[PDB]
Amino acid sequence: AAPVLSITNASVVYPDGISTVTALDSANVEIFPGELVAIVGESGSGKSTLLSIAGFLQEPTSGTVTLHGAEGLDATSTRREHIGFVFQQPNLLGSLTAREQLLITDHLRGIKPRKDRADELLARVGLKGLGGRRVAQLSGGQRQRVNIARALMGNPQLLLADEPTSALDARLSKEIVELLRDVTKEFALATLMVTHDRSQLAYADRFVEMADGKALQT
Amino acid sequence: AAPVLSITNASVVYPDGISTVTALDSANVEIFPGELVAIVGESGSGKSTLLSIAGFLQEPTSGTVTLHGAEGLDATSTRREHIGFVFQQPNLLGSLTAREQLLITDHLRGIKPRKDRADELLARVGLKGLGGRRVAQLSGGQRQRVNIARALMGNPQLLLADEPTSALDARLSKEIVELLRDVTKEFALATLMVTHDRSQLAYADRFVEMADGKALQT
Amino acid sequence: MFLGIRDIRAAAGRFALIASVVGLITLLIVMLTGLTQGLGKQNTSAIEALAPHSVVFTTAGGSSPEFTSSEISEQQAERWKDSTPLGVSQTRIESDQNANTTAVMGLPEGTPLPDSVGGFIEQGALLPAELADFLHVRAGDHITLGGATVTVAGTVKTENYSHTPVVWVDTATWQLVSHTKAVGTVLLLNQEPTIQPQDNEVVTDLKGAFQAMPAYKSERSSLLSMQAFLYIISALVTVAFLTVWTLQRTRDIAVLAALGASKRYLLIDALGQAAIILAAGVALGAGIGALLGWLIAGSVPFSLGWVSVLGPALGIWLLGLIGATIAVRNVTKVDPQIALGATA
Amino acid sequence: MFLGIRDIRAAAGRFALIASVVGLITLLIVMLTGLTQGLGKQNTSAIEALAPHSVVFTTAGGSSPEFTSSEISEQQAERWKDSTPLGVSQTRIESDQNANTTAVMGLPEGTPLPDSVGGFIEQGALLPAELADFLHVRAGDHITLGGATVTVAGTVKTENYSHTPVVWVDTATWQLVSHTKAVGTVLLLNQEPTIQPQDNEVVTDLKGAFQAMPAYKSERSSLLSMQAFLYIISALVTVAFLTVWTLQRTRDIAVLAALGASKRYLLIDALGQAAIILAAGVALGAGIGALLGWLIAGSVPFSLGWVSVLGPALGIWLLGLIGATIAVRNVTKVDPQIALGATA
Ligand SMILES: Nc1ncnc2c1ncn2[C@@H]1O[C@H](COP(=O)(O)OP(=O)(O)NP(=O)(O)O)[C@@H](O)[C@H]1O
Ligand SMILES: Nc1ncnc2c1ncn2[C@@H]1O[C@H](COP(=O)(O)OP(=O)(O)NP(=O)(O)O)[C@@H](O)[C@H]1O
Numbered sequence A, B: 001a002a003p004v005l006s007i008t009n010a011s012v013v014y015p016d017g018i019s020t021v022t023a024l025d026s027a028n029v030e031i032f033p034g035e036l037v038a039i040v041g042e043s044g045s046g047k048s049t050l051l052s053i054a055g056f057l058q059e060p061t062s063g064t065v066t067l068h069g070a071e072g073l074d075a076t077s078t079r080r081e082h083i084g085f086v087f088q089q090p091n092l093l094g095s096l097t098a099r100e101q102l103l104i105t106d107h108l109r110g111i112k113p114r115k116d117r118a119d120e121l122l123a124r125v126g127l128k129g130l131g132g133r134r135v136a137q138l139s140g141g142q143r144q145r146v147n148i149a150r151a152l153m154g155n156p157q158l159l160l161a162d163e164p165t166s167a168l169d170a171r172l173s174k175e176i177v178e179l180l181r182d183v184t185k186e187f188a189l190a191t192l193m194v195t196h197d198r199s200q201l202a203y204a205d206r207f208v209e210m211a212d213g214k215a216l217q218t
Numbered sequence C, D: 001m002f003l004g005i006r007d008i009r010a011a012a013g014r015f016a017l018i019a020s021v022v023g024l025i026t027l028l029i030v031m032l033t034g035l036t037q038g039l040g041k042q043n044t045s046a047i048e049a050l051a052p053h054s055v056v057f058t059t060a061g062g063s064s065p066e067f068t069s070s071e072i073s074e075q076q077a078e079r080w081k082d083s084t085p086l087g088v089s090q091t092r093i094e095s096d097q098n099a100n101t102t103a104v105m106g107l108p109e110g111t112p113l114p115d116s117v118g119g120f121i122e123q124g125a126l127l128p129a130e131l132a133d134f135l136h137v138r139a140g141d142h143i144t145l146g147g148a149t150v151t152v153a154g155t156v157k158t159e160n161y162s163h164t165p166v167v168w169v170d171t172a173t174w175q176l177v178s179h180t181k182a183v184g185t186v187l188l189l190n191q192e193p194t195i196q197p198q199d200n201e202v203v204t205d206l207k208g209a210f211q212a213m214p215a216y217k218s219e220r221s222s223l224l225s226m227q228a229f230l231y232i233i234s235a236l237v238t239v240a241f242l243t244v245w246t247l248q249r250t251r252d253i254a255v256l257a258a259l260g261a262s263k264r265y266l267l268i269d270a271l272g273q274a275a276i277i278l279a280a281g282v283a284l285g286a287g288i289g290a291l292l293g294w295l296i297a298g299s300v301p302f303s304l305g306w307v308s309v310l311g312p313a314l315g316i317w318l319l320g321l322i323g324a325t326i327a328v329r330n331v332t333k334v335d336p337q338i339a340l341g342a343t344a
């Protein structure tokens, strides 16, 4: 079984005026289909930085990231067709309704929006009947799950979830990570999921713990 | 001992186009000095709505909210002089540095910014040496604690913290709620703190659990 | 185009505000254009009114034709068939109670006048109503025109040569007041010259005929300068300003880019939205232009065609679209992680 | 003012972009103003150049004074001491090779001319250089002026009356070419009238003296219309546009409001920032105005004082501040929870 994603010896270095900050240092990550790999570590250890290059949001300053079955494609087309993002902040577009937050991903991927697909995914994250809400009429956790539902709207092979339960109560956060692994298993997805709720490791096949930008021995 | 804050029979009703949504229903909350009252409940139960009227961000649609020792003041002057907010989202001003995110509250409160006060509070939330960072150079949890530090910058009598540990690992989130109760105890503060991490109830004197906009029996 | 068209649904107030700014600028152009095109016809409206196709001048030494130095001899007139001789002079008009200098144009008796002006050439002088009121004279009175006594045959409406209203007289009268045996200053051709001219003659089309008016050249400079600065500044103000407007979407564009939106998708969305708002703004700005302009063209000279209302309108429509293109490009240029960073 | 001044530190690119838009509009005003003030002096620059304080006319029946109908009799001239008689005529000037109609002003021999024009009044005619070149004549030649043979005494620079350059002649010559025993058309007073005028006389200050020029009234309408639409549109374009700009801060203003910022604090911050950027924009826009305008005032008539560069500059400076006030008010009007909602 070939990996879906290979992060081979990757680093990110930002300039801090005179000095420089090494957000990520020599990351080596490889994930295969049907795997859900959790990512643990303290605030500021590099968890989102790892997903940012995993998701082709930026090229690494050293080393390479390869999504196979998408080599020979630019970063943008790779994200559009093969990756789903659950950003740390909800990142909802201001003028759309919850339902349309999902529909627009169909639009940018060049297919006619499927209206029924969206209310099902909205129902799955516990938001039935809230499809008409605007971002202002949604709570911090409700926004987060609109964020979540939007990531499952396409047919990616790589799912990147960045603390997707931060704004969720104990009961709902557990259903979200059951949701995430279930789709991981059903569609042979490669999923990385950052979380501070270490109880959730039970739903992960492996996990990477991180400190000061480095992955540690596990 | 007179209460610092009295939420006496308060409600918030929003229009949902044709229908209407009752975000908060007949809230009765009263908090005395040195109390840290936690607020628990599922995503969308009304936790932030309760703090929004507790903090004079909006007037309730029915019932009253009174901060005593500030009666005879408008909502805006009440917030400025007596209340500190830890918003659910960090709500950092785009062009300021972490250090200045604190300093500007001194500015709006009409006193000369105290530069040393700010780096101490930044150090307390585990961000020493990061005072120069811009919001773009901060992580989701780092932003959250800049948010937190900004709330302690004044001399409020009411502290409203809205899931202040959502983006924090287990170790740091515990230090933040130790920080919050410690200042609560030292300065005889009235603090309400929404959280999904129910382990944190150990640091609270009481807690209000909520479902469908109502407070429940405890 | 999905997000673009509902951004408008969700804040129609701010899109009205932005369309106003475009309409206000389109309106500025259409009125300032029509107000200066009006100032131009203070020198030219009379000859245009006569609607000649070609117009023959007379020079010496192959010089530039000049209305002040051309004369048509009577033999010259019999040569060119299908031609009418026009005399152009500036002279002193004097009544019992007042005086002025004014333009006097001369045509053969019975020549139908352009409908812009009263009726037919009669013997004597036809005065514009405003000149007649200025002089306090009516049909029947006597005036001194170029030192000669002439009878006011009637009043007519006003056309212009060299910033004066034109008095219309029969060729014999024009000969008397301008002190010449010539039958005219030029010959008007309403069809197109079928015969060739000599070494001292020069055929000119109506456009070039203004090059022969001295009052025109020495001010055409000032009017072109105005229409130049107005469009140059407007262009840059419009471009720069659609950039500032589209930039208020950097962050939602950044989010769409992160999810996988191609730059073509984003630019189509952006100018799709911009096309709609700019279309509204110029349509109304040019609308309020024609109505306001037609409303004011009785008290102030205001000439305005249809290439001068819709010429500017589409000029702003595409200039605004490039301004939107500038903005979308400076966001999509960067890796999306940085764009998501420049946003809070 | 704390946040306001560092918003500028943190995105100088977008604040340059916005200052450009203000400078571009200020520049549009300053050049269009100076280009039309130039068109105005095509009728008036000659009399202003002579710099009279008061100017006496002659009427009948208490009418409005008119340059075309006033004459100063020789006894009238001896009465008013400290006065100089000025003759104003429009007549035909004719050389061997060309001709024109032009304005002829007449003064007593030896009168120093305004420095805007050559030297002193000599016997004969002083032609503007451009008229002399047009006629192909030099000092020494003969011309026909008003049907009379006059000697070209020399050339001078150009001032204007009724859109023609002014030929300067001694009073006896002006009498000959305008066919009158009068010694002038008006009397120029350089100090202030100490004697009172009769029933048919009328004293006017230099401002009103233009009301007496026919070419002026019949176009002053067209120039005021331009300067009206330009400022009205500019005002509204500027106000509406500072609102669209300041609105891009609704959300950070909302956050400051939530923390306790008074509306005075927020408005001071907002116009403090706006004052800085608008100051830059108008300063440069008015700067590039004077330089570009001074650079072009040789080929195109371009008159511009200092109330016409700094008049517009501060006009935009305060109009922009109200536009910023409009925006800050529509955010601070609402309970902060709603403002935080209208933001994502
Ligand atoms: N402007 C609004 N209009 C309509 N409904 C709203 C509006 N704001 C909030 N609601 C609804 O009010 C309910 C509770 O709001 P809120 O207090 O923000 O949730 P919460 O208790 O803070 N939970 P969470 O933010 O997910 O941790 C939610 O169901 C919202 O959908
Ligand atoms: N543009 C940047 N410039 C300088 N430093 C940065 C920048 N971005 C991130 N950092 C630092 O990189 C380190 C890790 O970044 P990040 O991956 O966002 O944290 P994280 O692992 O996701 N933890 P958290 O978001 O708090 O749950 C932090 O210390 C940042 O301060």
Ligand SMILES: CCCCCCCCCCCC
Binding pocket: C005, C006, C008, C009, C276, C280
């Ligand atoms: C269902 C969403 C459709 C949104 C249509 C609103 C577009 C109106 C544009 C009018 C601009 C003049």
Ligand SMILES: CCCCCCCCCCCC
Binding pocket: D005, D006, D008, D009, D276, D280
């Ligand atoms: C320490 C922060 C001070 C910020 C000063 C920058 C202001 C520059 C304004 C220049 C505008 C022309």
Ligand SMILES: [Mg+2]
Binding pocket: A047, A048, A088, A162, B139, B140, B141
């Ligand atoms: Mg993170």
Ligand SMILES: [Mg+2]
Binding pocket: A139, A140, A141, B047, B048, B088, B162
């Ligand atoms: Mg909440």
